[PDB]
Amino acid sequence: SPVAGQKYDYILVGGGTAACVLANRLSADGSKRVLVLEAGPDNTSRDVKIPAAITRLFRSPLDWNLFSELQEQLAERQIYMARGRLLGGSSATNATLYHRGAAGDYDAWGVEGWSSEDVLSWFVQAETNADFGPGAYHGSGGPMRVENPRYTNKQLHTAFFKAAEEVGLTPNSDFNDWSHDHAGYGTFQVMQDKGTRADMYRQYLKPVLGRRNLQVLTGAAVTKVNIDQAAQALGVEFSTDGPTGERLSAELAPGGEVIMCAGAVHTPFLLKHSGVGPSAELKEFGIPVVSNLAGVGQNLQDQPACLTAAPVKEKYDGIAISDHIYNEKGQIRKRAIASYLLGGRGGLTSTGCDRGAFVRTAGQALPDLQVRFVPGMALDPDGVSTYVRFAKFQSQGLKWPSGITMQLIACRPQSTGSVGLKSADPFAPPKLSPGYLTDKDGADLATLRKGIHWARDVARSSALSEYLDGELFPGSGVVSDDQIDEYIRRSIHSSNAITGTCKMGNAGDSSSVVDNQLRVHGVEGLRVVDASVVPKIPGGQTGAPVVMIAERAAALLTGKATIG
Ligand SMILES: Cc1cc2nc3c(=O)[nH]c(=O)nc-3n(C[C@H](O)[C@H](O)[C@H](O)COP(=O)(O)OP(=O)(O)OC[C@H]3O[C@@H](n4cnc5c(N)ncnc54)[C@H](O)[C@@H]3O)c2cc1C
Ligand SMILES: CCCCCCCCCCCCCCCCCC(=O)O
Ligand SMILES: CCCCCCCCCCCCCCCCCC(=O)O
C-alpha cells in the first residue's frame, strides 16, 4: 500500500548498520530506486544519543529481547543476546568501540579478493578520526566519526595501565595500526562525535533522507523474500501491522536485487523462511526448498565473556565512574549533565568498557584474550545484567559501591553455534544456540580460565593493590581450576558480536552460503551484506568490519570496484 504500483532497483531487508551504509551509497547517483524495510522504529530516542544510556537500551523496547535455547554446557541456562531494533540497528545500541582486528584475521578467511591487503583501503575510506591524521591506517573524510574517549578516570585508568606494565604487557598506541602486533594495553577509540553516539543512522542514512529515489519504512517486518523457479528473487513480503497485519509485497524492477541486511541472527532466519536453507530443517515446517544450502544458520561465532570485580578501599570511595554519574541517592549528577551539554565531556560520554588489552594466554599466533577494564564495580557476575541493574538504580535512594571490573573475552573463539526455526511462524523468535565452550579442545574455556588468573595477577600488582580492598567476583569460593570452570559456566555472557551465519566462501566450498561477490548460491538477484557473511570473526568488536563490508559491497554494486 505504501509500495503499491512501485518497482525497486534495490530492496534492503533491515535498516541496521550495513543497510544504512548501502541506502546512502546506492541512492547517490539518483538513477536507482531503493527501499529500506526496518521492523523497529525511527531513531529519535535520547537513550540512543547519550553513550552512558546504553545501560537503558538492554532489555528495552529498542532491543529484540532474544534468549538462546537452554545451554546444558552452561549450567542449563538461557543466554540473553542483545540486538538493536530500530533504524541504525545494533550500531544504535552498541558500546561504540572501534576495532578492525589484525591483518591476520582477514588473511585467515582464505577467500579470494578479501585478504588484509584487499580490505584495508575500505576501512580507511569510511573513517574520519578526531585523534589520528591521515596515514597508512587512518583516513580523513569518510562519514564514520572515530575519536579517543572524552571521559578519563584519572586514578583508575592510570592504575590499570601501570598494573598491565607491571605484569609485563607492552603499550599498544593504536590497536588498528597493522604495522605492529595486536597485543598490548591502551585506550580503545569510539564511534562518537564529541561525546554523542555516531551510529550509522546518524552518519549515513539521516543526511540523505531528502532523496526522492530513497524510501525508508519503519514498523515494516519482512516475513520472506519472494523467490520463483521458472530461481530468481522477485521482491519481499512484509507486514506493517504485526502478526495479524495484511501481508504486502514490494516488487523488484527488472535487473533489481534483494539485499539481506537483517544481521547474523535474522538474515539466516529469513532465508530459511524463504526456502534457502538445509532441506531437512525446511521440510520439518513444510517450507518448500528453493536452494538446499547446508551452511545457512551454521558457523555462528560470538565472543563470550566473564568478569572479575573488586571494591576500592574506603579512603578511595567516590572515585569510580558510578560516582561520576550518580550521587549517593542515585540521582544523575548536575556536573555530569553540564559537562555533557557544555563540551561533550564527562561520564555520560562513556560506555564504561573503552580501556583494556589484547593478551596471548599461551603463545598463540594472535591474542586469544581481550580485556575490557571498567572503572566501576559490577554487582552481578553477568556484565550485561549489571548494566541493566545500573539503569534501574536511578532515584532508588541507594549508593552504588565504588570499585573496578575486568571483563575477559575470548576474542578469537573456536566454538560455533547455529540459528534455526522453532516454528513456521515468521514472527516467532529464532531457535538460537550460541554454542559457547563446545569446541572439542576446550580452548575457549582455557582462554577464559587463564583470563581470570591474569585479572587476579593485575589486581595483585603494586599499582592496583594500592586502590583495592579484596575481591567480590569470582570471590573467595573460586580458586581451583575446577571452581573457576564452574563460575565461568554459570556467569558467561555475550560481549555482543555474532557473525558468520551466511559464510562467504571460495568456489568449491560446499559449506559457504554466498560467493566472494556476496551472492546467495542458487538464487538470482539475492545478496547478503551484513555480519552474517564474515567467515571467521576478527579479534575485537565487529561493527567497523560490517561497515567495511557494506562500503565495498556498495562500490561493487555501483560499478566503482571489482572483487578478485
Ligand atoms: C549490545 C551490543 C554491543 C555491541 N558493542 C559493540 C562495540 O562496542 N563496537 C562494535 O564495533 N560492535 C559492537 N557490537 C556489534 C555491532 O553492533 C554489530 O556487529 C553490527 O552493528 C551488526 O551490523 P548488521 O548490519 O549486521 O546488523 P544490525 O545492525 O543488527 O542490523 C540488522 C537490522 O535488521 C532488522 N531486522 C531484523 N529482522 C527484520 C525483519 N524481519 N524485517 C525487517 N527488519 C528486520 C533489525 O531490527 C536491525 O535493525 C555490539 C552489538 C550489540 C548488540
Ligand atoms: C544511567 C544512564 C544515564 C542516562 C543519562 C540520562 C541523561 C539525562 C540528562 C538530561 C538529558 C540530557 C540533554 C538531552 C541531550 C540529548 C542528546 C543530544 O542531543 O546530544
Ligand atoms: C556507562 C556505564 C557505567 C556503568 C558502570 C556499571 C558498573 C560496571 C560493570 C561492568 C560490567 C562489564 C562490562 C559489560 C559491558 C556491557 C556492554 C557490551 O557488551 O557491549
mmCIF file of N, CA, C and O and ligand atoms in Angstrom, residues 12-20 37-40 54 58 63-64 80-99 191 200 220-224 238 261-267 269-270 351 353 372 384 426-427 495-499 529-532 540-547, ligand 1:
data_model
loop_
_atom_site.group_PDB
_atom_site.id
_atom_site.type_symbol
_atom_site.label_atom_id
_atom_site.label_comp_id
_atom_site.label_asym_id
_atom_site.label_seq_id
_atom_site.Cartn_x
_atom_site.Cartn_y
_atom_site.Cartn_z
ATOM 1 N N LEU A 12 16.327 -3.388 0.515
ATOM 2 C CA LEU A 12 17.165 -3.740 1.699
ATOM 3 C C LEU A 12 16.263 -4.319 2.781
ATOM 4 O O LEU A 12 15.361 -3.608 3.301
ATOM 5 N N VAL A 13 16.495 -5.578 3.142
ATOM 6 C CA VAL A 13 15.761 -6.197 4.266
ATOM 7 C C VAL A 13 16.553 -5.876 5.534
ATOM 8 O O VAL A 13 17.639 -6.449 5.693
ATOM 9 N N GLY A 14 15.995 -5.027 6.395
ATOM 10 C CA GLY A 14 16.664 -4.495 7.594
ATOM 11 C C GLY A 14 17.185 -3.086 7.336
ATOM 12 O O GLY A 14 17.689 -2.837 6.207
ATOM 13 N N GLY A 15 17.072 -2.202 8.341
ATOM 14 C CA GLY A 15 17.632 -0.832 8.291
ATOM 15 C C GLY A 15 18.710 -0.620 9.347
ATOM 16 O O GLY A 15 18.733 0.461 9.976
ATOM 17 N N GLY A 16 19.567 -1.624 9.531
ATOM 18 C CA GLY A 16 20.662 -1.617 10.517
ATOM 19 C C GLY A 16 21.949 -1.044 9.979
ATOM 20 O O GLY A 16 21.930 -0.173 9.096
ATOM 21 N N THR A 17 23.050 -1.498 10.566
ATOM 22 C CA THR A 17 24.409 -0.977 10.337
ATOM 23 C C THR A 17 24.737 -0.996 8.836
ATOM 24 O O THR A 17 25.021 0.078 8.270
ATOM 25 N N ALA A 18 24.792 -2.184 8.221
ATOM 26 C CA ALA A 18 25.131 -2.369 6.791
ATOM 27 C C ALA A 18 24.094 -1.647 5.914
ATOM 28 O O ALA A 18 24.501 -0.978 4.975
ATOM 29 N N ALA A 19 22.805 -1.752 6.247
ATOM 30 C CA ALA A 19 21.691 -1.191 5.432
ATOM 31 C C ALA A 19 21.812 0.334 5.313
ATOM 32 O O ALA A 19 21.623 0.864 4.209
ATOM 33 N N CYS A 20 22.120 1.018 6.408
ATOM 34 C CA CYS A 20 22.245 2.487 6.383
ATOM 35 C C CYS A 20 23.361 2.877 5.422
ATOM 36 O O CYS A 20 23.245 3.897 4.693
ATOM 37 N N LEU A 37 13.387 -1.588 4.433
ATOM 38 C CA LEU A 37 12.371 -2.103 5.381
ATOM 39 C C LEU A 37 13.028 -2.415 6.737
ATOM 40 O O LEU A 37 13.843 -3.329 6.783
ATOM 41 N N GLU A 38 12.607 -1.711 7.792
ATOM 42 C CA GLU A 38 13.067 -1.892 9.192
ATOM 43 C C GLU A 38 11.856 -2.252 10.052
ATOM 44 O O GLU A 38 10.850 -1.541 10.015
ATOM 45 N N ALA A 39 11.961 -3.320 10.823
ATOM 46 C CA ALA A 39 10.917 -3.762 11.754
ATOM 47 C C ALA A 39 10.775 -2.762 12.903
ATOM 48 O O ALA A 39 9.671 -2.537 13.355
ATOM 49 N N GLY A 40 11.859 -2.170 13.382
ATOM 50 C CA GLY A 40 11.762 -1.292 14.562
ATOM 51 C C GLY A 40 11.454 0.141 14.144
ATOM 52 O O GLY A 40 11.268 0.444 12.975
ATOM 53 N N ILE A 54 23.432 3.451 27.100
ATOM 54 C CA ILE A 54 23.486 2.021 26.662
ATOM 55 C C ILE A 54 22.883 1.150 27.770
ATOM 56 O O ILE A 54 22.169 0.161 27.456
ATOM 57 N N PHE A 58 19.545 -2.053 26.811
ATOM 58 C CA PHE A 58 19.423 -3.505 27.105
ATOM 59 C C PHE A 58 18.017 -3.792 27.640
ATOM 60 O O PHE A 58 17.544 -3.002 28.454
ATOM 61 N N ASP A 63 15.302 -3.144 21.789
ATOM 62 C CA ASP A 63 16.051 -4.413 21.693
ATOM 63 C C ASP A 63 15.101 -5.527 21.231
ATOM 64 O O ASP A 63 13.936 -5.475 21.620
ATOM 65 N N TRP A 64 15.607 -6.567 20.552
ATOM 66 C CA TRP A 64 14.769 -7.740 20.168
ATOM 67 C C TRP A 64 14.429 -8.635 21.365
ATOM 68 O O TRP A 64 13.645 -9.510 21.163
ATOM 69 N N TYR A 80 20.840 -14.342 27.281
ATOM 70 C CA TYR A 80 20.338 -13.116 26.632
ATOM 71 C C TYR A 80 21.364 -12.718 25.583
ATOM 72 O O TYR A 80 22.597 -12.733 25.867
ATOM 73 N N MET A 81 20.858 -12.395 24.399
ATOM 74 C CA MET A 81 21.693 -11.976 23.259
ATOM 75 C C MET A 81 21.106 -10.671 22.699
ATOM 76 O O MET A 81 20.229 -10.686 21.808
ATOM 77 N N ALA A 82 21.596 -9.553 23.225
ATOM 78 C CA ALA A 82 21.135 -8.200 22.836
ATOM 79 C C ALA A 82 21.318 -8.006 21.325
ATOM 80 O O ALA A 82 22.359 -8.481 20.725
ATOM 81 N N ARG A 83 20.324 -7.364 20.724
ATOM 82 C CA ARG A 83 20.272 -6.964 19.295
ATOM 83 C C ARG A 83 19.408 -5.708 19.201
ATOM 84 O O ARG A 83 18.277 -5.741 19.707
ATOM 85 N N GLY A 84 19.909 -4.684 18.514
ATOM 86 C CA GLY A 84 19.195 -3.430 18.238
ATOM 87 C C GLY A 84 18.020 -3.641 17.283
ATOM 88 O O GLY A 84 18.149 -4.404 16.296
ATOM 89 N N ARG A 85 16.935 -2.930 17.558
ATOM 90 C CA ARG A 85 15.666 -2.987 16.790
ATOM 91 C C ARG A 85 15.177 -1.558 16.511
ATOM 92 O O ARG A 85 14.342 -1.051 17.273
ATOM 93 N N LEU A 86 15.755 -0.914 15.498
ATOM 94 C CA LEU A 86 15.422 0.465 15.077
ATOM 95 C C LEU A 86 16.320 0.813 13.906
ATOM 96 O O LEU A 86 17.230 0.016 13.615
ATOM 97 N N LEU A 87 16.085 1.952 13.267
ATOM 98 C CA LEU A 87 16.953 2.405 12.167
ATOM 99 C C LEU A 87 18.344 2.618 12.764
ATOM 100 O O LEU A 87 18.454 3.325 13.782
ATOM 101 N N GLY A 88 19.345 2.024 12.137
ATOM 102 C CA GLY A 88 20.720 2.016 12.643
ATOM 103 C C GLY A 88 21.024 0.690 13.319
ATOM 104 O O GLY A 88 22.208 0.381 13.516
ATOM 105 N N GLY A 89 19.988 -0.068 13.662
ATOM 106 C CA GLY A 89 20.152 -1.430 14.180
ATOM 107 C C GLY A 89 21.084 -1.435 15.401
ATOM 108 O O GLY A 89 20.973 -0.557 16.285
ATOM 109 N N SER A 90 22.004 -2.388 15.440
ATOM 110 C CA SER A 90 22.900 -2.629 16.592
ATOM 111 C C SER A 90 23.951 -1.512 16.657
ATOM 112 O O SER A 90 24.492 -1.336 17.725
ATOM 113 N N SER A 91 24.215 -0.735 15.599
ATOM 114 C CA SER A 91 25.107 0.465 15.691
ATOM 115 C C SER A 91 24.519 1.506 16.674
ATOM 116 O O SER A 91 25.275 2.273 17.323
ATOM 117 N N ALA A 92 23.197 1.531 16.821
ATOM 118 C CA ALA A 92 22.449 2.466 17.680
ATOM 119 C C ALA A 92 22.431 2.016 19.141
ATOM 120 O O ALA A 92 22.092 2.850 19.990
ATOM 121 N N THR A 93 22.715 0.750 19.441
ATOM 122 C CA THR A 93 22.565 0.203 20.810
ATOM 123 C C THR A 93 23.899 -0.333 21.350
ATOM 124 O O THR A 93 23.880 -0.975 22.415
ATOM 125 N N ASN A 94 24.999 -0.159 20.615
ATOM 126 C CA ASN A 94 26.251 -0.893 20.915
ATOM 127 C C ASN A 94 27.145 -0.065 21.852
ATOM 128 O O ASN A 94 26.784 1.071 22.216
ATOM 129 N N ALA A 95 28.282 -0.612 22.241
ATOM 130 C CA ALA A 95 29.196 0.069 23.188
ATOM 131 C C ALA A 95 30.153 1.017 22.468
ATOM 132 O O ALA A 95 31.035 1.606 23.149
ATOM 133 N N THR A 96 30.016 1.163 21.149
ATOM 134 C CA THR A 96 30.738 2.152 20.319
ATOM 135 C C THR A 96 32.249 1.877 20.152
ATOM 136 O O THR A 96 32.900 2.713 19.518
ATOM 137 N N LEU A 97 32.810 0.756 20.611
ATOM 138 C CA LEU A 97 34.267 0.529 20.468
ATOM 139 C C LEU A 97 34.599 0.278 18.997
ATOM 140 O O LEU A 97 33.890 -0.508 18.336
ATOM 141 N N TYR A 98 35.683 0.885 18.533
ATOM 142 C CA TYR A 98 36.163 0.832 17.140
ATOM 143 C C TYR A 98 37.396 -0.070 17.007
ATOM 144 O O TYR A 98 38.510 0.300 17.376
ATOM 145 N N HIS A 99 37.180 -1.243 16.423
ATOM 146 C CA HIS A 99 38.175 -2.321 16.270
ATOM 147 C C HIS A 99 38.066 -2.892 14.870
ATOM 148 O O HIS A 99 36.939 -3.284 14.473
ATOM 149 N N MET A 191 33.202 5.172 18.345
ATOM 150 C CA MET A 191 32.366 5.692 17.249
ATOM 151 C C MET A 191 31.384 6.714 17.861
ATOM 152 O O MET A 191 30.200 6.436 18.059
ATOM 153 N N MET A 200 25.332 4.516 12.530
ATOM 154 C CA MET A 200 25.306 4.517 11.051
ATOM 155 C C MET A 200 24.004 5.164 10.540
ATOM 156 O O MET A 200 24.018 5.652 9.399
ATOM 157 N N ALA A 220 8.011 -2.056 9.642
ATOM 158 C CA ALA A 220 7.849 -2.926 8.450
ATOM 159 C C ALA A 220 8.652 -4.223 8.641
ATOM 160 O O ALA A 220 9.870 -4.241 8.383
ATOM 161 N N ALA A 221 7.981 -5.271 9.107
ATOM 162 C CA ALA A 221 8.559 -6.586 9.448
ATOM 163 C C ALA A 221 8.483 -7.520 8.239
ATOM 164 O O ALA A 221 7.394 -7.991 7.938
ATOM 165 N N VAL A 222 9.619 -7.780 7.598
ATOM 166 C CA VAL A 222 9.748 -8.721 6.461
ATOM 167 C C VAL A 222 9.484 -10.127 6.977
ATOM 168 O O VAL A 222 9.892 -10.437 8.106
ATOM 169 N N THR A 223 8.723 -10.901 6.194
ATOM 170 C CA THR A 223 8.263 -12.268 6.545
ATOM 171 C C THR A 223 8.945 -13.274 5.631
ATOM 172 O O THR A 223 9.115 -14.412 6.063
ATOM 173 N N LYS A 224 9.282 -12.881 4.402
ATOM 174 C CA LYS A 224 10.077 -13.740 3.481
ATOM 175 C C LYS A 224 10.465 -12.907 2.269
ATOM 176 O O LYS A 224 9.855 -11.851 2.071
ATOM 177 N N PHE A 238 6.054 -8.366 3.567
ATOM 178 C CA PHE A 238 6.184 -7.740 4.896
ATOM 179 C C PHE A 238 4.817 -7.356 5.432
ATOM 180 O O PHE A 238 3.865 -7.311 4.660
ATOM 181 N N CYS A 261 20.009 -7.518 4.894
ATOM 182 C CA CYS A 261 20.749 -6.654 5.859
ATOM 183 C C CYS A 261 20.139 -6.802 7.256
ATOM 184 O O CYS A 261 20.194 -5.847 8.012
ATOM 185 N N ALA A 262 19.594 -7.977 7.582
ATOM 186 C CA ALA A 262 18.824 -8.240 8.814
ATOM 187 C C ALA A 262 19.753 -8.759 9.935
ATOM 188 O O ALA A 262 19.289 -9.012 11.057
ATOM 189 N N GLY A 263 21.033 -8.915 9.618
ATOM 190 C CA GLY A 263 22.096 -9.251 10.581
ATOM 191 C C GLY A 263 22.280 -10.750 10.743
ATOM 192 O O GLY A 263 21.448 -11.558 10.234
ATOM 193 N N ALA A 264 23.292 -11.127 11.521
ATOM 194 C CA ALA A 264 23.733 -12.526 11.627
ATOM 195 C C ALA A 264 22.686 -13.373 12.371
ATOM 196 O O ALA A 264 22.805 -14.607 12.267
ATOM 197 N N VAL A 265 21.728 -12.779 13.084
ATOM 198 C CA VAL A 265 20.606 -13.577 13.668
ATOM 199 C C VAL A 265 19.468 -13.710 12.635
ATOM 200 O O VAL A 265 19.060 -14.861 12.313
ATOM 201 N N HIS A 266 18.927 -12.588 12.174
ATOM 202 C CA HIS A 266 17.645 -12.555 11.428
ATOM 203 C C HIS A 266 17.833 -12.833 9.926
ATOM 204 O O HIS A 266 16.874 -13.357 9.350
ATOM 205 N N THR A 267 18.985 -12.557 9.310
ATOM 206 C CA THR A 267 19.205 -12.881 7.876
ATOM 207 C C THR A 267 19.055 -14.391 7.622
ATOM 208 O O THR A 267 18.262 -14.784 6.771
ATOM 209 N N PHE A 269 17.577 -16.696 9.442
ATOM 210 C CA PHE A 269 16.167 -16.939 9.843
ATOM 211 C C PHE A 269 15.236 -16.667 8.653
ATOM 212 O O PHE A 269 14.412 -17.525 8.261
ATOM 213 N N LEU A 270 15.384 -15.496 8.045
ATOM 214 C CA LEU A 270 14.513 -15.083 6.919
ATOM 215 C C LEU A 270 14.839 -15.909 5.699
ATOM 216 O O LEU A 270 13.891 -16.197 4.968
ATOM 217 N N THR A 351 30.765 4.496 27.594
ATOM 218 C CA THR A 351 30.062 3.194 27.647
ATOM 219 C C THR A 351 30.752 2.299 28.674
ATOM 220 O O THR A 351 30.335 1.126 28.799
ATOM 221 N N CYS A 353 33.588 0.581 28.991
ATOM 222 C CA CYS A 353 34.459 -0.579 28.714
ATOM 223 C C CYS A 353 35.447 -0.227 27.594
ATOM 224 O O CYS A 353 35.677 -1.092 26.732
ATOM 225 N N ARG A 372 38.581 -5.897 28.892
ATOM 226 C CA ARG A 372 37.941 -4.567 28.965
ATOM 227 C C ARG A 372 37.929 -4.200 30.448
ATOM 228 O O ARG A 372 37.224 -4.869 31.228
ATOM 229 N N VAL A 384 26.203 -7.754 31.436
ATOM 230 C CA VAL A 384 25.013 -7.176 30.760
ATOM 231 C C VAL A 384 23.898 -7.012 31.802
ATOM 232 O O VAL A 384 23.290 -5.945 31.860
ATOM 233 N N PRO A 426 6.773 -16.681 10.974
ATOM 234 C CA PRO A 426 7.932 -15.804 10.784
ATOM 235 C C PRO A 426 8.038 -14.682 11.835
ATOM 236 O O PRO A 426 8.966 -13.882 11.742
ATOM 237 N N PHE A 427 7.102 -14.645 12.790
ATOM 238 C CA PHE A 427 7.028 -13.643 13.883
ATOM 239 C C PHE A 427 7.459 -14.284 15.191
ATOM 240 O O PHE A 427 7.565 -13.566 16.167
ATOM 241 N N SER A 495 29.640 -10.762 24.729
ATOM 242 C CA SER A 495 30.256 -9.438 24.505
ATOM 243 C C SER A 495 29.687 -8.830 23.224
ATOM 244 O O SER A 495 30.184 -7.801 22.798
ATOM 245 N N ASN A 496 28.692 -9.481 22.632
ATOM 246 C CA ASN A 496 27.745 -8.874 21.664
ATOM 247 C C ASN A 496 28.425 -8.655 20.301
ATOM 248 O O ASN A 496 28.475 -7.500 19.822
ATOM 249 N N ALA A 497 28.893 -9.734 19.683
ATOM 250 C CA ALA A 497 29.406 -9.726 18.299
ATOM 251 C C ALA A 497 28.354 -10.396 17.404
ATOM 252 O O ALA A 497 27.372 -9.727 17.050
ATOM 253 N N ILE A 498 28.515 -11.690 17.149
ATOM 254 C CA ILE A 498 27.587 -12.554 16.365
ATOM 255 C C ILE A 498 27.827 -12.317 14.871
ATOM 256 O O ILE A 498 27.367 -11.313 14.316
ATOM 257 N N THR A 499 28.537 -13.256 14.275
ATOM 258 C CA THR A 499 28.904 -13.283 12.851
ATOM 259 C C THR A 499 28.793 -14.699 12.293
ATOM 260 O O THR A 499 28.668 -15.671 13.089
ATOM 261 N N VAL A 529 24.520 -8.601 2.737
ATOM 262 C CA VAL A 529 25.563 -7.602 3.092
ATOM 263 C C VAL A 529 25.327 -7.193 4.542
ATOM 264 O O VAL A 529 24.517 -6.290 4.781
ATOM 265 N N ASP A 530 25.940 -7.942 5.457
ATOM 266 C CA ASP A 530 25.823 -7.789 6.929
ATOM 267 C C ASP A 530 26.839 -8.733 7.595
ATOM 268 O O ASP A 530 27.703 -9.280 6.883
ATOM 269 N N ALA A 531 26.816 -8.804 8.930
ATOM 270 C CA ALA A 531 27.792 -9.575 9.729
ATOM 271 C C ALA A 531 27.697 -11.063 9.373
ATOM 272 O O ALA A 531 28.646 -11.814 9.676
ATOM 273 N N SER A 532 26.597 -11.521 8.777
ATOM 274 C CA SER A 532 26.392 -12.977 8.578
ATOM 275 C C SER A 532 27.471 -13.529 7.631
ATOM 276 O O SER A 532 27.794 -14.705 7.731
ATOM 277 N N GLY A 540 38.182 -8.569 18.265
ATOM 278 C CA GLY A 540 37.672 -7.244 18.666
ATOM 279 C C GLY A 540 36.227 -7.101 18.252
ATOM 280 O O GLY A 540 35.662 -8.051 17.667
ATOM 281 N N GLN A 541 35.645 -5.954 18.565
ATOM 282 C CA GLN A 541 34.204 -5.701 18.322
ATOM 283 C C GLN A 541 33.951 -5.603 16.793
ATOM 284 O O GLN A 541 34.804 -5.126 16.049
ATOM 285 N N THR A 542 32.770 -6.040 16.349
ATOM 286 C CA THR A 542 32.527 -6.401 14.929
ATOM 287 C C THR A 542 31.826 -5.305 14.120
ATOM 288 O O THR A 542 31.703 -5.489 12.896
ATOM 289 N N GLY A 543 31.530 -4.148 14.708
ATOM 290 C CA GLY A 543 30.887 -3.043 13.977
ATOM 291 C C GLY A 543 31.697 -2.493 12.807
ATOM 292 O O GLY A 543 31.124 -2.349 11.686
ATOM 293 N N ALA A 544 32.959 -2.117 13.023
ATOM 294 C CA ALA A 544 33.753 -1.498 11.936
ATOM 295 C C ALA A 544 33.899 -2.481 10.765
ATOM 296 O O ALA A 544 33.836 -2.068 9.623
ATOM 297 N N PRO A 545 34.201 -3.776 10.961
ATOM 298 C CA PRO A 545 34.233 -4.720 9.835
ATOM 299 C C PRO A 545 32.924 -4.787 9.028
ATOM 300 O O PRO A 545 32.991 -4.874 7.802
ATOM 301 N N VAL A 546 31.763 -4.708 9.674
ATOM 302 C CA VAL A 546 30.452 -4.702 8.963
ATOM 303 C C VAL A 546 30.363 -3.483 8.040
ATOM 304 O O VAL A 546 29.982 -3.643 6.856
ATOM 305 N N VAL A 547 30.807 -2.328 8.513
ATOM 306 C CA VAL A 547 30.734 -1.076 7.721
ATOM 307 C C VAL A 547 31.690 -1.238 6.549
ATOM 308 O O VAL A 547 31.319 -0.813 5.437
HETATM 309 C C1 LIG B 1 24.830 -4.546 22.883
HETATM 310 C C2 LIG B 1 25.787 -4.566 21.725
HETATM 311 C C3 LIG B 1 27.053 -4.082 21.921
HETATM 312 C C4 LIG B 1 27.996 -4.064 20.893
HETATM 313 N N1 LIG B 1 29.155 -3.355 21.110
HETATM 314 C C5 LIG B 1 29.917 -3.160 20.051
HETATM 315 C C6 LIG B 1 31.015 -2.295 20.123
HETATM 316 O O1 LIG B 1 31.378 -1.741 21.145
HETATM 317 N N2 LIG B 1 31.649 -1.980 18.953
HETATM 318 C C7 LIG B 1 31.413 -2.645 17.786
HETATM 319 O O2 LIG B 1 32.105 -2.329 16.773
HETATM 320 N N3 LIG B 1 30.417 -3.518 17.689
HETATM 321 C C8 LIG B 1 29.704 -3.768 18.763
HETATM 322 N N4 LIG B 1 28.588 -4.546 18.626
HETATM 323 C C9 LIG B 1 28.417 -5.304 17.375
HETATM 324 C C10 LIG B 1 27.959 -4.480 16.209
HETATM 325 O O3 LIG B 1 26.989 -3.556 16.728
HETATM 326 C C11 LIG B 1 27.289 -5.408 15.179
HETATM 327 O O4 LIG B 1 28.156 -6.488 14.831
HETATM 328 C C12 LIG B 1 26.819 -4.683 13.915
HETATM 329 O O5 LIG B 1 26.124 -3.478 14.264
HETATM 330 C C13 LIG B 1 25.896 -5.576 13.089
HETATM 331 O O6 LIG B 1 25.504 -4.920 11.878
HETATM 332 P P1 LIG B 1 24.406 -5.605 10.921
HETATM 333 O O7 LIG B 1 24.196 -4.643 9.805
HETATM 334 O O8 LIG B 1 24.942 -6.959 10.631
HETATM 335 O O9 LIG B 1 23.111 -5.799 11.858
HETATM 336 P P2 LIG B 1 22.207 -4.855 12.758
HETATM 337 O O10 LIG B 1 22.896 -3.540 12.882
HETATM 338 O O11 LIG B 1 21.808 -5.679 13.945
HETATM 339 O O12 LIG B 1 21.002 -4.667 11.757
HETATM 340 C C14 LIG B 1 20.005 -5.685 11.442
HETATM 341 C C15 LIG B 1 18.672 -4.972 11.290
HETATM 342 O O13 LIG B 1 17.642 -5.837 10.708
HETATM 343 C C16 LIG B 1 16.418 -5.561 11.351
HETATM 344 N N5 LIG B 1 15.500 -6.688 11.148
HETATM 345 C C17 LIG B 1 15.578 -7.937 11.691
HETATM 346 N N6 LIG B 1 14.606 -8.729 11.296
HETATM 347 C C18 LIG B 1 13.836 -7.945 10.449
HETATM 348 C C19 LIG B 1 12.658 -8.210 9.723
HETATM 349 N N7 LIG B 1 12.026 -9.388 9.742
HETATM 350 N N8 LIG B 1 12.172 -7.193 8.964
HETATM 351 C C20 LIG B 1 12.827 -6.022 8.952
HETATM 352 N N9 LIG B 1 13.911 -5.654 9.630
HETATM 353 C C21 LIG B 1 14.373 -6.678 10.361
HETATM 354 C C22 LIG B 1 16.829 -5.318 12.806
HETATM 355 O O14 LIG B 1 15.854 -4.693 13.613
HETATM 356 C C23 LIG B 1 18.089 -4.455 12.614
HETATM 357 O O15 LIG B 1 17.865 -3.053 12.599
HETATM 358 C C24 LIG B 1 27.644 -4.606 19.640
HETATM 359 C C25 LIG B 1 26.369 -5.174 19.461
HETATM 360 C C26 LIG B 1 25.428 -5.097 20.456
HETATM 361 C C27 LIG B 1 24.022 -5.567 20.204
#
